Subunit: 160 residues, 2 copies
């Protein structure tokens, strides 16, 4: 049950735009960077970020998918690999993504961009770019919807 909407299409749009500028900024350009989306919605976010970045620096950035969910390629070695996910929670999915990435190559470094951080981490992993911090109880859940797959851009808190 949709207990509440915390981000509308507008907030999402402006969050991803800022994030696009932060990525370019913290890497002093996009040279050697690659956006790898985790899971369904993570991939769509990575693409939007890629598109935004392209229309700011004039140069485009490679995008990869990589599948996880409690377990085509893309440049990895000596590249700045930016994992992109919709929701940061326990951090366990991200840990798996890192190992996966580490087996495909030796990246200069791995960064983490997420649309929302709902707290409750169970590993010492933090996102380098956060769209919005959304406090939540352990009993609540986060639902992220994007136009490409859900017919709408929206983030909400759903009770159990």
């Amino acid at each position: 049950m949709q207990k509440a909407v915390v981000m509308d299409e507008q907030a999402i749009r402006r969050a991803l735009t800022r994030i696009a500028h932060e990525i370019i900024e913290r890497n002093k350009g996009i040279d050697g960077c690659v956006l790898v989306g985790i899971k369904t919605r993570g991939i769509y976010l990575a693409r939007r970020l890629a598109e935004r970045i392209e229309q700011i620096e004039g140069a485009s950035v490679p995008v990869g998918e990589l599948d996880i969910t409690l377990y085509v390629p893309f440049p990895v070695t000596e590249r700045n690999v930016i994992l992109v996910d919709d929701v940061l929670f326990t951090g366990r999915t991200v840990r798996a993504a890192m190992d996966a990435v580490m087996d495909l190559g030796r990246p200069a470094r791995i960064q983490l961009a997420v649309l929302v951080d709902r707290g409750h981490r169970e590993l010492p992993i933090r996102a380098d770019f956060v769209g919005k911090n959304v406090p939540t109880s352990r009993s609540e859940l986060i639902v992220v919807e994007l136009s490409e797959v859900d017919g709408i851009d929206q983030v909400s808190i759903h009770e159990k």
Copy 2:
């Protein structure tokens, strides 16, 4: 060579004593928690923490040892809070491998990380839950940690190696 002393013995003691209190606080006591040191100095730090924690809560805390080295102990893990302890957080690559090791021994309820110093320049989305001191450094500088159990003195210093 040693450029400057960023932490002296008293600072190190005050940093560790506080971390001990921070650990108890965030976990509301140390039950179900385990201290796992990484390499030599990490182990000595983890031991100091456990000694401090027990005198505070009157409850003993399990200390483990992990030998994690990258190129260029028993007990519980499953359903426990494994608190990794290291002297310096840098690229974060060592902690990531250390987490792999922990996962090979079981599934902890969670993993935390405590370090004496964070010198920035991470190359992985890994951050410490408890930090002794944030020490800014250039990529040309180096951190040198000396603990009395191995170097006869407690001291943190920046070097231009």
